[PDB]
Amino acid sequence: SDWSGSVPANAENGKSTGLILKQGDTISVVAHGWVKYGRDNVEWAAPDGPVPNNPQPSSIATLVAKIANKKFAIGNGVLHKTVPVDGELILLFNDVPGTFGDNSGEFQVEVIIESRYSPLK
Ligand SMILES: OC[C@H]1O[C@H](OC[C@H]2O[C@H](O[C@]3(CO)O[C@H](CO)[C@@H](O)[C@@H]3O)[C@H](O)[C@@H](O)[C@@H]2O)[C@H](O)[C@@H](O)[C@H]1O
Ligand SMILES: [Ca+2]
């Protein structure tokens, strides 16, 4: 993997991967494991999001990619997706701001930069 590490659910600013992406690059991601987005026994999330017996609002408590303050869905993973904007890849458990204090656990995530942008010409 270009980067492998943990994404803590309680990190309100996510986990910086150090991968500096450019528009037109392609990346793949897979994310494993389980986190809590609250203290109650039902408030569990996979990267794809809350367990559906306790749904939360759109995008909340899901694993997203933050690139230059833009957010993109990742969830359990993506394959060979084109990057739309330049920026460092930050992986984030997208809880509601200010509600990370009751979060626990971490995802195990792998990122591969499948290609760096180069046009056919
Ligand atoms: O949406 C993100 C948010 O989800 C959870 O909070 C929403 C949850 O709040 C209330 O649930 C309880 C009731 O006591 O209140 C706390 C809120 O932190 C929960 O632990 C507990 O279940 C509502 O009554 C529920 O309908 C609603 O789903 C999570 O707790 C927050 O930290 C935040 O991540
Ligand atoms: Ca929370």
Token pair 């408030």 in the structure block, residue: 43
Burial of 103 (0-12, 13-18, 19+ CB in 10 A): buried
In contact, 45 and 33? CB cutoff 8 Å = no
| Three-point CA angle 86, 90, 93, nearest 5° | 140
Annotated resolution, angstroms = 1.8
Of ligand 1's listed atoms, the one at least distance from the Cα of 39 is: 20
Choose which residue among 41, 54, 56, 60 to substitute to test ligand 1 binding: the one with the highest number of ligand atoms within 8 A of its C-beta: 56
Residue 98 zone, left/alpha/beta (φ > 0; ψ -120 to 50; rest): left
Compute the Cα dihedral for 4, 14, 55, 103 and give only its sign: positive
Query: What is the topology classification, in CATH, of domain 1-121?
Result: Jelly Rolls (2.60.120)
Query: What is the experimental method?
Result: X-ray
Å from CA of 21 to ligand 1 middle: 35
d(CA 89, CA 85): 10
52's CB contacts (< 8 A; 6+ apart) are none
Q: Which residues pair with 89 in a beta bridge?
A: 67
Burial of 13 (0-12, 13-18, 19+ CB in 10 A): exposed
d(CA 23, CA 57): 29
Please state the domain extents for the chain. Answer: 1-121
Phi, psi of 102 (to 5 degrees): -100, 20
Binding site members = 37, 43, 56, 95, 99, 102-103
